[PDB]
Design an enzyme around this catalytic site. Structure first.
Site, PDB file in Angstrom:
ATOM      1  CB  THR A  16      -0.960   0.008   1.194  1.00 13.80           C
ATOM      2  OG1 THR A  16      -0.228  -0.231   2.403  1.00 13.80           O
ATOM      3  CG2 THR A  16      -2.052  -1.045   1.027  1.00 13.80           C
ATOM      4  CG  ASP A  39       9.179  -9.222 -26.221  1.00 15.44           C
ATOM      5  OD1 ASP A  39       8.464  -8.421 -25.571  1.00 15.44           O
ATOM      6  OD2 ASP A  39      10.327  -8.943 -26.616  1.00 15.44           O
ATOM      7  CG  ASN A 161       8.018   2.932 -23.963  1.00 16.52           C
ATOM      8  OD1 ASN A 161       7.289   2.729 -22.993  1.00 16.52           O
ATOM      9  ND2 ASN A 161       8.788   1.986 -24.494  1.00 16.52           N
ATOM     10  N   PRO A 175      -9.867  -1.424 -26.961  1.00 20.57           N
ATOM     11  CG  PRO A 175     -11.740  -0.108 -27.399  1.00 20.57           C
ATOM     12  CD  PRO A 175     -10.676  -0.926 -28.087  1.00 20.57           C
ATOM     13  CB  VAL A 177      -6.384  -5.996 -24.630  1.00 21.57           C
ATOM     14  CG1 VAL A 177      -6.881  -6.930 -25.737  1.00 21.57           C
ATOM     15  CG2 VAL A 177      -5.846  -4.698 -25.210  1.00 21.57           C
ATOM     16  CG  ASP A 200      -7.691  -1.080 -19.283  1.00 17.12           C
ATOM     17  OD1 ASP A 200      -7.157  -1.425 -20.358  1.00 17.12           O
ATOM     18  OD2 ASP A 200      -8.907  -0.813 -19.188  1.00 17.12           O
ATOM     19  CG  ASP A 260      -1.978   5.759  -3.561  1.00 20.48           C
ATOM     20  OD1 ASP A 260      -2.254   4.563  -3.347  1.00 20.48           O
ATOM     21  OD2 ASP A 260      -2.436   6.692  -2.866  1.00 20.48           O
TER      22      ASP A 260
END
Length: 279
Positions: A16, A39, A161, A175, A177, A200, A260
Site C-alpha cells: 500500500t 516478443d 513510450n 478497448p 484488452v 486500464d 497514489d
C-alpha cells in the site's frame, strides 16, 4: 510468502506504500497458470526460469532471444527472483527479430497462434498473454488482440513510450484488452509513459531489474517492463481463483491502489496494480 531484497517493482505490487523492498505473495505463485510472452523470444535455459520456460513458436531463423527484451519481460512475469508469478509456466512466441522489430502481419499471426495454441497446453488455472510491443494505430492489430482476449486469454499490452495519448497506438488502443502504463519507484508516472482514457492500469516500469540473455540480469525501463508485472499479477490472481481471463483486467483495476500516482493527466486512470495479499 516473503521475498526479501526484491526488485522495487515486486515490492510495490504487494504494498500500500512505496519505499519498501520485500515482496509478499501467496505461495501458490501462479502454479497451474500459463503466460505467453509474445516478443523477441525467451532464453529458457536461464537458471532463473527453473525449467518452467519454453519457446513454442518463432517466425524467424531461430527461436532464441538474440536481443534480451523478451527474456527480461519473461523474467518479470515468472522468474524465481525477478518474477511476479514464480511458479507459472512461460511460453515464448518470437514475433520480433533480434533488433526488436517486427511486421504487423507477423504480430497478428502470433496473437492468433496463442489463441489456438493454448488448447495444446495444460493451464487449468487460466491463460495470460503479455505483449510488450506496439506501433501506430492499426484496426487489424487491435482486432487480433481483441480475438485473443475473446478466446479466453487475459491480454496485457504496453501503452507505449511516447509520452503521448495511447489512443494512437496499437494494440494499446484496443478497448477490450488491458493497456498498461508505467510508474517509477516514487509513484510518479514514468517520464516516457503514454497516457489517456484507453489505459486500464499502471505498473512498475522505471529501472526494472530482470533476466537478460547470456544468463545475466539488468535493469531497464519502459511500458514493456510494466506490462509483464500486470500479466504476472493476472496469472497469480487466476491461480488463487479470484478472477478469470475475461474479468482479470477489471478485477486488477477494482483492487488497485487508487489516487497514489503523480503526474497522471486529467482523464487517465490513477490506478496502480496491487495484489492485495495479506500475509
Amino acid at each position: 510468502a516473503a521475498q526479501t531484497n526484491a526488485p522495487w517493482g515486486l515490492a510495490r505490487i504487494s504494498s500500500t506504500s512505496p519505499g519498501t523492498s520485500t515482496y509478499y505473495y501467496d505461495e501458490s505463485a501462479g502454479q497451474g497458470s500459463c503466460v505467453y510472452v509474445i516478443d523477441t523470444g525467451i532464453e529458457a535455459s536461464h537458471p532463473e526460469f527453473e525449467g518452467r520456460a519454453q519457446m513454442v513458436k518463432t517466425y524467424y531463423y531461430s527461436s532464441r532471444d538474440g536481443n534480451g527484451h523478451g527474456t527480461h519481460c519473461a523474467g518479470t512475469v515468472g522468474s524465481r527472483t525477478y518474477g511476479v508469478a514464480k511458479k507459472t509456466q512461460l511460453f515464448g512466441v518470437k514475433v520480433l527479430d533480434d533488433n526488436g522489430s517486427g511486421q504487423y502481419s507477423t504480430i497478428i499471426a502470433g496473437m492468433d497462434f496463442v489463441a489456438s495454441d493454448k488448447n495444446n497446453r495444460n493451464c487449468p488455472k487460466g491463460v495470460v498473454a503479455s505483449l510488450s510491443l506496439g506501433g501506430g494505430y492499426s484496426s487489424s492489430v487491435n482486432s487480433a488482440a481483441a480475438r485473443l482476449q475473446s478466446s479466453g486469454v487475459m491480454v496485457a499490452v504496453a501503452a507505449g513510450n511516447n509520452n503521448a495519448d495511447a489512443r494512437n497506438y496499437s494494440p494499446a488502443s484496443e478497448p477490450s484488452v488491458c493497456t498498461v502504463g508505467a510508474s517509477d519507484r516514487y509513484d510518479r508516472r514514468s517520464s516516457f509513459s503514454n497516457y489517456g482514457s484507453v489505459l486500464d492500469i499502471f505498473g512498475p516500469g522505471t529501472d526494472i531489474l530482470s533476466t537478460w540473455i547470456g544468463g545475466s540480469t539488468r535493469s531497464i525501463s519502459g511500458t514493456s517492463m510494466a506490462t509483464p508485472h500486470v500479466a504476472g499479477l493476472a496469472a497469480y490472481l487466476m491461480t488463487l481463483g479470484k478472477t478469470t481471463a475475461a474479468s482479470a483486467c477489471r478485477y486488477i483495476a477494482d483492487t488497485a491502489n487508487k489516487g497514489d500516482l503523480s503526474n497522471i493527466p486529467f482523464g487517465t486512470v490513477n490506478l496502480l496494480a496491487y495484489n492485495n495479499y495479506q500475509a
